[PDB]
Structures are given as C-alpha cells and as structure tokens.
Amino acid sequence: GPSSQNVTEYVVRVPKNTTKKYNIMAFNAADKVNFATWNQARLERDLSNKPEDQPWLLRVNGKSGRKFKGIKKGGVTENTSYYIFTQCPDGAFEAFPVHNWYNFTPLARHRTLTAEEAEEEWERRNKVLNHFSIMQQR
Amino acid sequence: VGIRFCQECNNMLYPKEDKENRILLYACRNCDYQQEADNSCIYVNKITHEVDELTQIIADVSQDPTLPRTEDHPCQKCGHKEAVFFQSHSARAEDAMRLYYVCTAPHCGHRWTE
Amino acid sequence: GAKKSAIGQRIVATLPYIKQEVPIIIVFRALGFVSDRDILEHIIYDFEDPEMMEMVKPSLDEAFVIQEQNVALNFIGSRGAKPGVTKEKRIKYAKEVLQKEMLPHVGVSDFCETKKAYFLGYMVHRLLLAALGRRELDDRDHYGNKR
Amino acid sequence: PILEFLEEWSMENLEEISPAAIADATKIFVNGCWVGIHKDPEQLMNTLRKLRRQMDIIVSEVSMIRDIREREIRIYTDAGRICRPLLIVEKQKLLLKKRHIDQLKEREYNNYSWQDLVASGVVEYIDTLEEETVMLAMTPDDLQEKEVAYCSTYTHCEIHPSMILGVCASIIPFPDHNQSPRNTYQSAMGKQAMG
Amino acid sequence: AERGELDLTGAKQNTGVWLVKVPKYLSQQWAKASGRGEVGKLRIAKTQGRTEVSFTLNEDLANEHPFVLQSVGGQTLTVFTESSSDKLSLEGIVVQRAECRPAASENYMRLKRLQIEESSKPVRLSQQLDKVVT
Amino acid sequence: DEITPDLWQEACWIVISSYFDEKGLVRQQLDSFDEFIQMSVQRIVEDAPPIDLQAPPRYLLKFEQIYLSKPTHWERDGAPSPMMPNEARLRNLTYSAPLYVDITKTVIKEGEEQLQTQHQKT
Amino acid sequence: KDILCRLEHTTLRKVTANTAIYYDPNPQSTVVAEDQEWVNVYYEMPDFDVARISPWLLRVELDRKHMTDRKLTMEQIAEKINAGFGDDLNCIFNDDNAEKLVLRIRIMNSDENKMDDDVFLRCIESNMLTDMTL
Ligand SMILES: [Zn+2]
Ligand SMILES: [Zn+2]
C-alpha cells in the first residue's frame, strides 16, 4: 500500500524559550538499559564538592537498582548544533536545541577494595596467586 | 578463545571449576557472578601461527596509488582484469614473498593469493 | 618465575612527575573507566580479535586489586614526586597530573578525560599492534617524524 | 578551520560515538590529536585535497596523509614540517599547460606568478609524510608515457630532478658524473673558496 | 519524593524522538526567527528499501537540505530535561538520527569561508608602529 | 594546449625561475620570524594569565595589545633615530625593535566600585 | 647433520605447533573427539592414573616436519618430560601413526587427591616451552 511509498512534509517550529531545557542522555550499547523496570530514578549532582560544572549521579529504584554517573560532553561544537525533532499530529515539527549532552556509565555496587585494603593487598602483586582467594577472603 | 564479561559488573570472567559437579564455570572476580561455560577450552595459543594475511588485508588498498596493478589476474567474483598485488607486510611472515591480490573494482573486496 | 612466565608481557605507563611507571589499567581506572569492558572497548576496537585480548590479560590481572577511581588516584598520588600527606591531597595531586600534565595536547578541561582515554586507548592499541607485529615499528630517522 | 570543516563532513566526534563504530571507520587525527572518525575516508580525502588545491579553507602547507591499510587520516597543520612543491598529475597528464608557461613567460607587466600556479591547483606542496602516499613521476617526458606501463597511477611529478641538490651542491657541473664522496668534498670547499 | 526525581512519563509512554545535527548558522537563523515558527519545512519520503529526508529554509529567513540518516542500533540515546522548577523528566528515546547538510557544495565552501572569516576577526596581531612612543 | 617533451626542458626552468622570483632562498628564515612577531608574540601575551593581587583592595593587570616600532637607536642625548643595519654593523649596535604592550589596570576596594585605567603602549 | 642435531639446542617450543588447555574430567569422554580413539587405549589399562587424575588437561601439537627434521619422536619426548618432572605430570600420547602428534598432560593422582591445579598448567606449559630441553 501507500505506506511503502508515502511522502510527507511538515513545518518546523522552534519555540523561543521553554520552561525545561533539553539535554541528551546516552548509554553504552552493552548496558542494555530498560526504562520499564525503572520504577524510580534520581538524577542529581555528585557529592565530591562536599557545582554547576560537576558530574551527575543517576540512580534507579533507589539503592536497590542500577547506579550511573553522568559526565558532560567536554567537546563543544562551535560550528554545529543538535536538535530533537518530535512527531506531532498537527503536521508540524517542534525542535528543541540540545543544551547539554551527558554520557552515562554504570557504577558497580559491591564491596570494592578500599584505598587502605588496596594498599595492603598491593604488596601481593609481587607473588599473588589464585586471585579469587583475595575476594573470598574479603 | 572467546572472552566473556560479567553481565553484572562488565568485568572479566575467569574460568572456574565446581568441585561439587566438576564442570567449567566462568566466574566473575570481585562480583560472585558465575556462568555455565560451554566452550570447555580455557586457553589456546598457536606457536606457528600460520594465519592467512587475507584476513588482515583490507579491501580499501585497491585505492592506494603506490601499489602495483596487473591485468593478468582477473578477479574470480567479478572478472575485473585489473588487480592490485603486494606482499605480506607482516613481520611474522618468515617468508614474506608471496603475492596477495585485491580486486580493483569498486565494492568488490575479493582477495586471493597465487 | 612460574607465576610471571604464566602471565607474560604486561604494560606499564611512565607518566610525568611520577617516580615509577604505573600499570596502564590504573590510568584508565583513574580516568574513571571502571569495568574491564569500558577499558577494553577503548583499547581493542574489534573484540573478535583474540590475539589482542590475550595481550591485555596480564595488564588486567595486575590492576585487579584497584577497582575504584579514588583508589587508583590515591595509588597514583602515592607514587607522585610530591607525596601527599593525606589521601585527599594525593587524589587532588593525581587528579592534577592526569588533568594537566598527561596528554595536554588532547585537552586540559575537566571533561577532556574522555578524549584522553581514547588517545591513551589508541597509544596502547599502537603498542599492541607493534608487539603483535601487525604494524612496523616507527623509524627515528624518518623526516616525516621530524620537525 | 580544519576542525570546523570536518564537523560539516559528518566526522563523528569521539565523545559522540560508541566504540563499536571504531572498527570500520577511519580515525581522523589533526596535529596528532584524535579528533574523530569517518565512514567514507576516500570522499573525505578527495574533498580535503580539492579544498587545499583551491586554497578555500585549507592552506597550502597543511598535509593530509591517508594510511589506507591502517584506516587513519592524519592532518598536520603544525609548523616545522619540511615540504616541497610538486606538479600535480591527473589521468596520467600534467595539470600544467602551455597557457601557464606562456603566462609565466610574461611574468612581469602581468603580475602572474608562482602564487597563481598554487592557486590554480597546478602545483602543490608535499611534505615528507604525504610523500609516502604519493606515486611520483620523475619526468613527464618518460615516466608517465603509456608505453612504459611501469605505473599508470602517478599522482605527482617532479619539477626538475636537480632540485634535490642544495646550494653548494648546485654549483657542481655534471655532479651525476662524479663519485659521491667528491660531491660532498666540493660542497665543503665551495664554502671555503674566494670570490 | 525528592528534588532529583525524574518524571519518566516520556519513557513510560515510549515517546520516540529524532535527533538531528544541524549547522550553527542554520540553527542561528532558526533561533533568530524562532518567534515566527515558520523557519522552514521538513519533508520525509520512504520507499521499499530506501528513504530520504530534506529541509527547506524559508526564503525570508535565508535572505534544499537533504538529511543523512544514521542507524540508532549502535548506541542507546535518550532525551531528558530539567525544569526551571527544579524537577527533572525524561522526554523520550532517540529512535532516528540524521544530519542536515545543503544539497549544493561548491557554494557551501564559500559560506564556510564566510563563517570562518567572521570567526577569525578576533585574532589580534602585533601592529607595526611608524614612530617610537614618547 | 600541452607541454610537449621538446618544450619541457625550457618549461620546467620557467616554473622554477618563477618560484625563486616569488619565494627566494631564505624564505624559511623570514617567514618564520614574521609569524613569530605577528602571531606568536601576541599569543604569548594574551595567553599569559592576568596578574591578580590582593592586600583588602584587589588589583588586576591585563596585557592587551602588542605594538612593535621600527628598529630604533637612542643616542647618548636620548634622541631616538631609526637604525640602519649598516650602522648596526659598523657601530656594533644591536638591531632591535622597541616592543610595547597596552595594559589595563583595574582595582577594586570592596566598595562596590572598580577603577579601570589603561596604560597605552607601555 | 646428525651431530648438528645433537648439538643444536632444541626445546619443545621448536617442535610444538600449538598448545591448548582444556577442562575434561572424564577421559572416557575426551572433549577432543580425535583423542577419544586413542586416549581410551591408555584408560583400558591405566597406571598411576587409575584412582584419580586432574580434570585440567594440557594438549600440545607437534609438527611432523619439525619433529622429523630434528629426528625426534613423541616417544623420547614423553620420556624426557617424565624424566624431568617425574610422575608429577602424567603424559599420555597418541601413536606415531596418527595424522597429528598429540600429547595430553594431567597432574598426578596424589596431587589431585604443587602450586595449583589449574593455573599451574600455564606455568608448566610456559616452562615446557622454554626451559625444558629435548
Ligand atoms: Zn561481575
Ligand atoms: Zn573483483
């Protein structure tokens, strides 16, 4: 049917200002993030300052779900820009400028060796064997 | 050969054996994640490494203007008479003298050796 | 040694203003790349190449002890030419080295760590290809390499 | 100007891609800084060369090197790169025609000069790195003749092979008829002579 | 309930969005004429095994841009926003990616030079002085 | 139409002669110094971080523009004179150009007021 | 040339083509299909490996040309391994008539019933391919 050869043209609209600034949040293909299971989520600035130009922390389902850290894209494009176009029933596209771009990486949740423990186990590097034992001991 | 990463922490999976059942398991260090291994081979290395450069040759070399071209070796897949020929270019080739050919025709990345 | 000969060749980075070369994986950890996949995706672009994979194995095993960026930064700072009197000074010192001293041409801004990881990933990749013999070693006499 | 131009040509920025894309695309480096990756390196290089020859956005001394077997495109804009002018060859024919020579003969009272050859895309500066990617004819009178068939893909041609010699070496007559140590000793004595 | 909580309705409703890359001059004209809401028209055409998209700028604003489409399977991209009321939300997932470029190229190299010239004006150079400062 | 092999020998020496008429031989020295003065000298002055001083009044010095006068010699009496290179070789002078920089000084005395003064051609 | 062959330092690295470490606890079901035809010959009348053996197994392939060029055969090599390591390494190998020379190694029954059982095979492999002299 016509769907195999359809052609359509829509007007482009660009609001002068919006109550919410648009940003891009990208995840790695191997993370296979799924938003259906995200019953709850938090996006907030990091606590390393304990700010506007500091990393962000993304947590899903509180402490029980996945955790991610969002880093702002350092390389700006002085000659290029990104826009998000959305489908609309009135026959006109609304375009939003990408104010920011954030790449998110998951943060593992487990008893990672502390700085003190790493300093202690580092000496083993000279003769360590059966690395599984180090985690089984810890 | 194939390397597996922990689905929980994306760290490397290391081979393990369950003394309880004696089957190979790929267990994640620092993560207590374990996966039923299927390959059964934990390591393999080829000392003579007689691997074919045809796997390493890139079809784009057909565009290099410094490579020689010959009309005597028409491509089997497309019949194009002009082909680009060159040597191994790998230090592991102890006898790096045989010629590898690449079809000069666009979108025909066929490679062979005489 | 049996343990050493079993792991083979391993990679170390001789960073600036640091007394002893740190294991390469510590720098990726210090740059904030946690999982081995996040690090290997920057070093090996074609996972279907098991030869490159076997080359990085010992580098991962040596750094296994360090699984946290702050721990990696503390480790780097601990070997710094100016030993930090505290973990916070050590981390800030290490952060300053990685932020300004390592690979300045790639960038010095707070978010250039991603570009530094790719370039450091590429430096390792070049080292792997050379050790695997897939690329010829660079020639010091080549005027293309001179200025 | 190069970095800004590459953004228009779909060069994907490293911070805007997944590592899985680095396998097939070619790495684009500017002054050794890895700027991004590109999916169609042949069209890109042709475009970069066309702009350099036209002097639109890329100055004559910028060198573009495409390492075909390594999927790398390196663009160097830095100083200190030694380079030299070479006549461009297309379809085994020199781009330099009699109209250029006639205009160069009538150099004075006409203001036509070397800069017009560069702007016309007739001659271009090749640096020692780009020379590795170049297939260079020694002379048009014999090297690009179809009967020789040694190479049918020359990219450039030397202006005169004697321009490989320096200032003191250019003073020797028939240096091609002397033992090489003798050309070296003369290059030293020429600096010690009197005049 | 927290200041960092994100309204996931955009994701829950599976809102699909298209990410498009455009030149700053193009977006600058659109931003200048943003109050008009008539910056141009976007045309989309699909066939049995091929599809094409292009944008046409309003004549009054200029005083054809085919789009190069890109696969979205290589990386999972999403769109989120931050409200001035300190409330975040997820607007949707990027289901299509494209880049806007003009159909013409030779004249575009000129327009690039025009942008480069305007961008080069701040490059201050040491001025030669005819007489010594007394 | 095209350069025939019998004309190439004459043609290539015409092209080369035009190259040396335009570029000359010492072009590497001259162009390298021209770039240094025109660009490198100015970039260094702008890239240097502005001097900030604190007592408490706050003072800031911003270097802003470089000017370079023709090589000038100052006689014992202090009269400046353009120095010709032959005079420099003969009188053992150093053929140097006076370098000047515009400096803008801003001072803040925590009194919601800032005083900005510019020292032209320092 | 026989004297030359006896003088030239020859190590297993020169005669082995490739090597691999497998996990197969049941020798009656060798993970390598080709070994099943010949390994069962040894397990038909097992000795020193009747009661127990390490499930970890190291397999080495020797180049017939490199072997014959040096006038070496699997017989003395197997004996040399057991001569050097003793009964610590149970060496089992296919008949010379096979299309490929194959040797299987497992740690002794009493060690399975000295650093490790699994990773130590890499030490053995690397050691056999470096310091062991035929
Ligand atoms: Zn894990
Ligand atoms: Zn073909």
Side-chain angles (χ1 to χ4, degrees), chain B residues 74-80 82 102-105 108-110 112:
Chain B
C75 175
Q76 288 69 43
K77 280 196 182 180
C78 68
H80 190 263
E82 197 178 27
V102 181
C103 185
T104 317
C108 180
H110 186 223
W112 68 102

PDB file of all heavy atoms in Angstrom, chain B residues 74-80 82 102-105 108-110 112, ligand 2:
ATOM      1  N   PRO B  74      42.570 -11.720 -13.413  1.00  0.00           N
ATOM      2  CA  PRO B  74      41.191 -11.237 -13.309  1.00  0.00           C
ATOM      3  C   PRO B  74      40.506 -11.792 -12.072  1.00  0.00           C
ATOM      4  O   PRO B  74      40.689 -12.955 -11.705  1.00  0.00           O
ATOM      5  CB  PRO B  74      40.528 -11.751 -14.595  1.00  0.00           C
ATOM      6  CG  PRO B  74      41.301 -12.976 -14.943  1.00  0.00           C
ATOM      7  CD  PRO B  74      42.729 -12.664 -14.527  1.00  0.00           C
ATOM      8  N   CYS B  75      39.712 -10.942 -11.426  1.00  0.00           N
ATOM      9  CA  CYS B  75      39.009 -11.358 -10.222  1.00  0.00           C
ATOM     10  C   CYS B  75      38.000 -12.455 -10.526  1.00  0.00           C
ATOM     11  O   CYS B  75      37.235 -12.371 -11.488  1.00  0.00           O
ATOM     12  CB  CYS B  75      38.301 -10.176  -9.570  1.00  0.00           C
ATOM     13  SG  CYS B  75      37.308 -10.694  -8.164  1.00  0.00           S
ATOM     14  N   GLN B  76      38.012 -13.490  -9.690  1.00  0.00           N
ATOM     15  CA  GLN B  76      37.101 -14.615  -9.861  1.00  0.00           C
ATOM     16  C   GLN B  76      35.647 -14.201  -9.674  1.00  0.00           C
ATOM     17  O   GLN B  76      34.768 -14.644 -10.422  1.00  0.00           O
ATOM     18  CB  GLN B  76      37.459 -15.741  -8.892  1.00  0.00           C
ATOM     19  CG  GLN B  76      38.739 -16.480  -9.240  1.00  0.00           C
ATOM     20  CD  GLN B  76      39.975 -15.636  -9.041  1.00  0.00           C
ATOM     21  OE1 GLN B  76      40.095 -14.922  -8.048  1.00  0.00           O
ATOM     22  NE2 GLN B  76      40.897 -15.702  -9.993  1.00  0.00           N
ATOM     23  N   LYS B  77      35.372 -13.346  -8.688  1.00  0.00           N
ATOM     24  CA  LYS B  77      33.993 -12.951  -8.422  1.00  0.00           C
ATOM     25  C   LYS B  77      33.419 -11.996  -9.464  1.00  0.00           C
ATOM     26  O   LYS B  77      32.216 -12.054  -9.739  1.00  0.00           O
ATOM     27  CB  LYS B  77      33.924 -12.285  -7.049  1.00  0.00           C
ATOM     28  CG  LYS B  77      33.897 -13.234  -5.872  1.00  0.00           C
ATOM     29  CD  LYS B  77      33.443 -12.501  -4.624  1.00  0.00           C
ATOM     30  CE  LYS B  77      33.453 -13.408  -3.411  1.00  0.00           C
ATOM     31  NZ  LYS B  77      33.004 -12.681  -2.192  1.00  0.00           N
ATOM     32  N   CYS B  78      34.227 -11.116 -10.051  1.00  0.00           N
ATOM     33  CA  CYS B  78      33.676 -10.149 -10.993  1.00  0.00           C
ATOM     34  C   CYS B  78      34.358 -10.123 -12.350  1.00  0.00           C
ATOM     35  O   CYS B  78      33.879  -9.408 -13.237  1.00  0.00           O
ATOM     36  CB  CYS B  78      33.712  -8.727 -10.419  1.00  0.00           C
ATOM     37  SG  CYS B  78      35.353  -8.085 -10.237  1.00  0.00           S
ATOM     38  N   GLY B  79      35.448 -10.858 -12.548  1.00  0.00           N
ATOM     39  CA  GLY B  79      36.090 -10.834 -13.843  1.00  0.00           C
ATOM     40  C   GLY B  79      36.876  -9.580 -14.150  1.00  0.00           C
ATOM     41  O   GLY B  79      37.423  -9.474 -15.255  1.00  0.00           O
ATOM     42  N   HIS B  80      36.949  -8.620 -13.226  1.00  0.00           N
ATOM     43  CA  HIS B  80      37.704  -7.402 -13.486  1.00  0.00           C
ATOM     44  C   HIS B  80      39.169  -7.759 -13.691  1.00  0.00           C
ATOM     45  O   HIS B  80      39.792  -8.400 -12.841  1.00  0.00           O
ATOM     46  CB  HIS B  80      37.539  -6.435 -12.315  1.00  0.00           C
ATOM     47  CG  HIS B  80      38.067  -5.061 -12.578  1.00  0.00           C
ATOM     48  ND1 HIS B  80      39.316  -4.651 -12.165  1.00  0.00           N
ATOM     49  CD2 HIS B  80      37.510  -3.998 -13.203  1.00  0.00           C
ATOM     50  CE1 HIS B  80      39.504  -3.395 -12.526  1.00  0.00           C
ATOM     51  NE2 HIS B  80      38.426  -2.976 -13.161  1.00  0.00           N
ATOM     52  N   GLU B  82      41.917  -5.737 -13.910  1.00  0.00           N
ATOM     53  CA  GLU B  82      42.912  -5.047 -13.101  1.00  0.00           C
ATOM     54  C   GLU B  82      42.828  -5.463 -11.641  1.00  0.00           C
ATOM     55  O   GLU B  82      41.758  -5.411 -11.027  1.00  0.00           O
ATOM     56  CB  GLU B  82      42.734  -3.538 -13.236  1.00  0.00           C
ATOM     57  CG  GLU B  82      43.925  -2.721 -12.797  1.00  0.00           C
ATOM     58  CD  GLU B  82      43.704  -1.239 -13.006  1.00  0.00           C
ATOM     59  OE1 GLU B  82      42.534  -0.805 -12.983  1.00  0.00           O
ATOM     60  OE2 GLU B  82      44.695  -0.510 -13.213  1.00  0.00           O
ATOM     61  N   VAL B 102      44.139  -8.081  -4.673  1.00  0.00           N
ATOM     62  CA  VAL B 102      42.858  -7.485  -4.328  1.00  0.00           C
ATOM     63  C   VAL B 102      42.246  -6.939  -5.603  1.00  0.00           C
ATOM     64  O   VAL B 102      42.933  -6.290  -6.397  1.00  0.00           O
ATOM     65  CB  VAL B 102      43.003  -6.364  -3.283  1.00  0.00           C
ATOM     66  CG1 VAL B 102      41.646  -5.789  -2.945  1.00  0.00           C
ATOM     67  CG2 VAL B 102      43.684  -6.884  -2.034  1.00  0.00           C
ATOM     68  N   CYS B 103      40.964  -7.207  -5.805  1.00  0.00           N
ATOM     69  CA  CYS B 103      40.278  -6.709  -6.986  1.00  0.00           C
ATOM     70  C   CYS B 103      40.183  -5.193  -6.959  1.00  0.00           C
ATOM     71  O   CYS B 103      39.842  -4.601  -5.933  1.00  0.00           O
ATOM     72  CB  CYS B 103      38.887  -7.308  -7.106  1.00  0.00           C
ATOM     73  SG  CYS B 103      38.117  -6.790  -8.635  1.00  0.00           S
ATOM     74  N   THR B 104      40.483  -4.566  -8.090  1.00  0.00           N
ATOM     75  CA  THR B 104      40.469  -3.113  -8.168  1.00  0.00           C
ATOM     76  C   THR B 104      39.065  -2.557  -8.364  1.00  0.00           C
ATOM     77  O   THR B 104      38.847  -1.362  -8.140  1.00  0.00           O
ATOM     78  CB  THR B 104      41.365  -2.645  -9.314  1.00  0.00           C
ATOM     79  OG1 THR B 104      42.578  -3.405  -9.305  1.00  0.00           O
ATOM     80  CG2 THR B 104      41.709  -1.173  -9.167  1.00  0.00           C
ATOM     81  N   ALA B 105      38.108  -3.393  -8.750  1.00  0.00           N
ATOM     82  CA  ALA B 105      36.755  -2.912  -8.981  1.00  0.00           C
ATOM     83  C   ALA B 105      36.098  -2.462  -7.679  1.00  0.00           C
ATOM     84  O   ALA B 105      36.268  -3.104  -6.639  1.00  0.00           O
ATOM     85  CB  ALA B 105      35.911  -4.002  -9.636  1.00  0.00           C
ATOM     86  N   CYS B 108      34.006  -4.618  -4.826  1.00  0.00           N
ATOM     87  CA  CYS B 108      34.466  -5.994  -4.973  1.00  0.00           C
ATOM     88  C   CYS B 108      35.749  -6.127  -4.162  1.00  0.00           C
ATOM     89  O   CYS B 108      36.852  -5.927  -4.670  1.00  0.00           O
ATOM     90  CB  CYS B 108      34.684  -6.380  -6.414  1.00  0.00           C
ATOM     91  SG  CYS B 108      35.256  -8.073  -6.521  1.00  0.00           S
ATOM     92  N   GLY B 109      35.588  -6.476  -2.895  1.00  0.00           N
ATOM     93  CA  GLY B 109      36.697  -6.636  -1.984  1.00  0.00           C
ATOM     94  C   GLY B 109      37.308  -8.018  -2.027  1.00  0.00           C
ATOM     95  O   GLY B 109      37.907  -8.464  -1.045  1.00  0.00           O
ATOM     96  N   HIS B 110      37.156  -8.716  -3.148  1.00  0.00           N
ATOM     97  CA  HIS B 110      37.678 -10.070  -3.231  1.00  0.00           C
ATOM     98  C   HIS B 110      39.190 -10.083  -3.165  1.00  0.00           C
ATOM     99  O   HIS B 110      39.869  -9.262  -3.781  1.00  0.00           O
ATOM    100  CB  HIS B 110      37.247 -10.747  -4.527  1.00  0.00           C
ATOM    101  CG  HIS B 110      37.632 -12.191  -4.598  1.00  0.00           C
ATOM    102  ND1 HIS B 110      38.157 -12.763  -5.736  1.00  0.00           N
ATOM    103  CD2 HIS B 110      37.603 -13.169  -3.663  1.00  0.00           C
ATOM    104  CE1 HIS B 110      38.419 -14.037  -5.505  1.00  0.00           C
ATOM    105  NE2 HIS B 110      38.093 -14.309  -4.254  1.00  0.00           N
ATOM    106  N   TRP B 112      42.692 -12.854  -2.904  1.00  0.00           N
ATOM    107  CA  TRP B 112      43.172 -14.201  -3.167  1.00  0.00           C
ATOM    108  C   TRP B 112      44.685 -14.156  -3.261  1.00  0.00           C
ATOM    109  O   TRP B 112      45.293 -13.085  -3.302  1.00  0.00           O
ATOM    110  CB  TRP B 112      42.534 -14.807  -4.416  1.00  0.00           C
ATOM    111  CG  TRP B 112      42.908 -14.175  -5.704  1.00  0.00           C
ATOM    112  CD1 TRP B 112      43.802 -14.639  -6.615  1.00  0.00           C
ATOM    113  CD2 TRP B 112      42.336 -12.996  -6.269  1.00  0.00           C
ATOM    114  NE1 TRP B 112      43.848 -13.805  -7.700  1.00  0.00           N
ATOM    115  CE2 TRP B 112      42.953 -12.787  -7.512  1.00  0.00           C
ATOM    116  CE3 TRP B 112      41.371 -12.089  -5.838  1.00  0.00           C
ATOM    117  CZ2 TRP B 112      42.638 -11.709  -8.325  1.00  0.00           C
ATOM    118  CZ3 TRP B 112      41.060 -11.021  -6.647  1.00  0.00           C
ATOM    119  CH2 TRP B 112      41.692 -10.837  -7.874  1.00  0.00           C
TER     120      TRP B 112
HETATM  121 ZN    ZN H   2      36.593  -8.499  -8.345  1.00  0.00          ZN
END
